[PDB]
Design a protein around this nucleic acid. Structure first.
Ligand SMILES: [Zn+2]
Length: 635
RNA sequence: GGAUCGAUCGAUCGAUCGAUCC
């Protein structure tokens, strides 16, 4: 039943103006959107038909919205449907939009349609409902739809424009420090979404917080370990590896010029990636020993990166977990390669393992952060044995490490694995949620706690300034609601005019393609893969090769997760067809009836025939050449 | 495969991590 609370948010939208309706409850926002849809479709006279559209960004929320809209809008006789990645194949989306009223298509589908030519004008709709509209920041599908909307509006051909009624939970601040910058950011959001009112409950505050978030904070700053024998042994191993890596590259310290680097930090991983991407462009004229040098440097650098990841895991998670990670990596790479370099590194790690295993089993080397984590878990469960806790972790390499720790720790047995009956649900990013534990990470059950565990004061200061930013965002929302409509509409119109101007400004023309027939080579092998004259672009995003000689240059491998995406269907991945390379080149797909190995320029190095410079690109867009379109008439 | 977002880190750009969509 619609209560007065759900109507105090819908009143500013039923009048016929664009809003930024915001509520902390999901069910509340859904019911408000349903009431707005009902009041908007029922207000039209006879002869006209409404085409309200809903924008869900995720598949689960899309399914929930489609289900609730189909169950609600039944007695009214409105055709409600939905379009996603599993429905926009060989269906005339124009026929779906023209013959429906409450379509709930995802925003990427509407962006693709507006780009293709289907649905030329955006005036076909009469009410747009953006779900979680605080994502309208930059280049987002919501922002691209709003760019088309503002271009058709300010362009001087404004037709029957639709209402752009939004829906969010937090208006968001971004990186504002003073109240002026937060007000500017909220005005920029309201301009990009083109709304004149920010609906927020200012009358019904009594029954607001009965069944809402109502969180709490229990910051717990901890210290790191001191008896770091494992870190010392791994640092000695990495120093030996880096020392024996300089036998072929004397200026390895010269290739990456940033600062002093230390083992076990993200800066070391960045230095590793930089020295990898810098030593992969050698131009030795032998082209035979140069391949061995590049492969040896790639192997040493991959081993250093794995050791650095193991150090970070041992710093955050347990020691046995980092040891298991290193053993798993070594066992996985042992079956792929059999060269003397891999043998040397594996035998060195095996020599160190006889002592690393004894060091890991030492009960006096337990992490203190895991210690007081299990302590606070024990005390909170002794306080209440029916608490469904969620433990957020930064890396996905630790969501399973902490699960193994919970399953192995004898001091606690009441917990169950809940990697995302299941008591604790160890997740990474997003129900009851009776307890949250942000472990090194930077809405119900009134009485729930939220413990933040970290070994750095940085996260504590960031959470403090985040609470201050939430307070200042509430104050700025009150200040904006205090304003009238005229000056606010003029301000948002000026903001969107300036944004349209600066957007028309940054228009990069077509870069002049090189008429030279440059070629591609593997990363860790430097073997001739294919000439760029043999590369065909499929849909301005995907690239493939049609050469018969290229068909034998790779080897297929079953994909761990195949899923078709509106154009193709995945079948397998492709690897380099050498003795001990096994380098990830791309993915094998089917377009309509053919089998095509679509490659990625990330795992490739470009070599020119004119000069001979070896360039390394990241994405296809940065790579400029004669993009020959895919011709099905050939093969 | 491609795009998008967020966090961290490093010289307006780049790297890593995580998530989303097509
Ligand atoms: Zn290769």
């Amino acid at each position: 039943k619609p209560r007065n609370y759900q109507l105090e948010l819908a009143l500013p939208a039923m009048k016929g103006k664009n809003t930024i309706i915001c509520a902390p409850t999901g069910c509340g926002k859904t019911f408000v959107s349903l009431l707005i849809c009902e009041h908007h479709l029922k207000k039209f006279p006879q002869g006209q038909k409404g085409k309200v559209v809903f924008f869900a960004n995720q598949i689960p929320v899309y399914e929930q919205q489609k289900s609730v809209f189909s169950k609600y809008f039944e007695r009214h006789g409105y055709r409600v449907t939905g379009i996603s990645g599993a429905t926009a194949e060989n269906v005339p989306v124009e026929q779906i939009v023209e013959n429906n009223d409450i379509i709930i298509l995802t925003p990427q589908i509407l962006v693709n349609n507006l780009k293709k030519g289907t649905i030329p004008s955006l005036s076909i709709f009469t009410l747009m409902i953006f779900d979680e509209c605080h994502n309208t920041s930059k280049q987002h599908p919501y922002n691209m739809i709003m760019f088309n909307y503002l271009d058709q509006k300010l362009g001087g051909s404004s037709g029957p424009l639709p209402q752009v009624i939004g829906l969010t939970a937090s208006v968001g601040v971004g990186d504002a420090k003073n109240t002026d910058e937060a007000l500017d950011y909220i005005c920029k959001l309201c301009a990009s979404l083109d709304a004149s009112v920010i609906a927020t409950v200012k009358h019904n505050l009594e029954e607001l917080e009965q069944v809402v978030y109502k969180p709490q904070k229990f910051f717990r700053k901890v210290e790191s370990r001191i008896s770091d024998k494992f870190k010392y042994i791994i640092a000695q191993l990495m120093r030996d590896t880096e020392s024996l890596a300089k036998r072929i590259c004397k200026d390895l310290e010269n290739l990456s010029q940033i600062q002093n680097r230390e083992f076990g930090t993200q800066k070391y991983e960045q230095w590793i990636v930089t020295v990898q991407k810098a030593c992969m462009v050698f131009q030795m004229p032998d082209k035979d020993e140069e391949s061995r040098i590049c492969k040896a440097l790639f192997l040493y650098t991959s081993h250093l990166r794995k050791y650095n990841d193991a150090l970070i895991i041992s710093e955050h998670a347990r020691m046995k977990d980092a040891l298991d990670y290193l053993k798993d990596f070594f066992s996985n790479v042992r079956a792929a390669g059999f060269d003397e370099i891999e043998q040397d590194l594996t035998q060195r790690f095996e020599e160190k393992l006889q002592e690393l295993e004894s060091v890991s089993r030492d009960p006096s080397n337990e992490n203190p952060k895991l210690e007081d984590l299990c302590f606070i878990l024990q005390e909170e469960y002794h306080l209440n044995p029916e608490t469904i806790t969620i433990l957020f972790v930064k890396t996905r390499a630790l969501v399973d490490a902490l699960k193994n720790w919970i399953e192995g720790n004898p001091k606690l047995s009441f917990l169950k694995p809940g990697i995302l009956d299941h008591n604790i649900l160890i997740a990474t990013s997003v129900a009851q949620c009776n307890l949250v534990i942000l472990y090194e990470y930077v809405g119900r059950a009134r009485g729930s706690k939220c413990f933040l565990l970290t070994s750095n004061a940085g996260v504590i200061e960031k959470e403090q300034i985040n609470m201050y930013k939430e307070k200042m965002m509430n104050d700025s929302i009150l200040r904006l609601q205090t304003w009238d409509e005229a000056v606010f509409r003029e301000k948002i119109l000026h903001i969107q005019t300036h944004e349209k101007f600066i957007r028309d400004s940054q228009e990069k023309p077509k870069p002049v393609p090189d008429k030279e027939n440059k070629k591609l080579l593997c990363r860790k092998c430097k073997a001739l893969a294919c000439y760029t004259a043999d590369v065909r672009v499929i849909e301005e995003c995907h690239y493939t090769v049609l050469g018969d000689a290229f068909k034998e240059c790779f080897v297929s491998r079953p994909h761990p997760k195949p899923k078709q995406f509106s154009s193709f269907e995945k079948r397998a991945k492709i690897f380099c067809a050498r003795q001990n390379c096994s380098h990830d080149w791309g993915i094998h797909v089917k377009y309509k009836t053919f089998e095509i190995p679509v490659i990625k320029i990330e795992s490739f190095v470009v070599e020119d025939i004119a000069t001979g410079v070896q360039t390394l690109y990241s994405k296809w867009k940065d790579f400029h050449f004669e993009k020959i379109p895919f011709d099905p008439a050939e093969m």
